[PDB]
Design a binder for this molecule. Structure first.
Ligand SMILES: O=C(O)Cc1c[nH]c2ccc(F)cc12
Length: 115
C-alpha cells in the first residue's frame, strides 16, 4: 500500500517517464493515489495511468469516479497539488507542463473531501 515514490527511486521514476515518452509519446504519465487519511473511498485497482494528452481534466475526474464504482451520493474529489480538478475543462497536456513533478510524472490524489 506504499506510495509510488516509496516504491521507486527518483532515477527509476525518471527512466520510466522517458520510456513512456518513447513508447506512448501522446500520453501523459499520471500517478493517481488515494489520500493518506481517506476513510470512505476504496483503494483503486491501479495507480499508473497513461492519459491521452487531449483529455480534459474534468473528464479524467468522471473517469476515475466511474472506476471507483460509487453511488451518486458519495463525495469524490481528484486533486493535483491540492487543486480540485472537477471544473477544469483544460486538456491534461496543458496542466502537465505546469504541474508535473521533477521526475516527469503528474501526481494526483483523490479523497472524499476537498479540504
Ligand atoms: O483509465 C485509463 O486506463 C487511462 C486513461 C485515462 N483517461 C483516458 C482516456 C482515453 C484513454 F484511451 C485512456 C485513458
Amino acid at each position: 500500500d506504499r506510495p509510488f515514490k516509496q516504491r521507486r527511486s527518483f532515477a527509476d521514476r525518471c527512466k520510466e517517464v522517458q520510456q513512456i515518452r518513447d513508447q506512448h509519446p501522446s500520453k501523459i504519465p499520471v500517478i493517481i493515489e488515494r489520500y493518506k487519511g481517506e476513510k470512505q473511498l476504496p483503494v483503486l485497482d491501479k495507480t499508473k495511468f497513461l492519459v491521452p494528452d487531449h483529455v480534459n481534466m474534468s473528464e479524467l475526474v468522471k473517469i476515475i469516479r466511474r472506476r471507483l464504482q460509487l453511488n451518486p451520493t458519495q463525495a469524490f474529489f481528484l486533486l493535483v497539488n491540492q487543486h480540485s480538478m472537477v471544473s477544469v475543462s483544460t486538456p491534461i497536456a496543458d496542466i502537465y507542463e505546469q504541474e508535473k513533478d521533477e521526475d516527469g510524472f503528474l501526481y494526483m490524489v483523490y479523497a472524499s473531501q476537498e479540504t
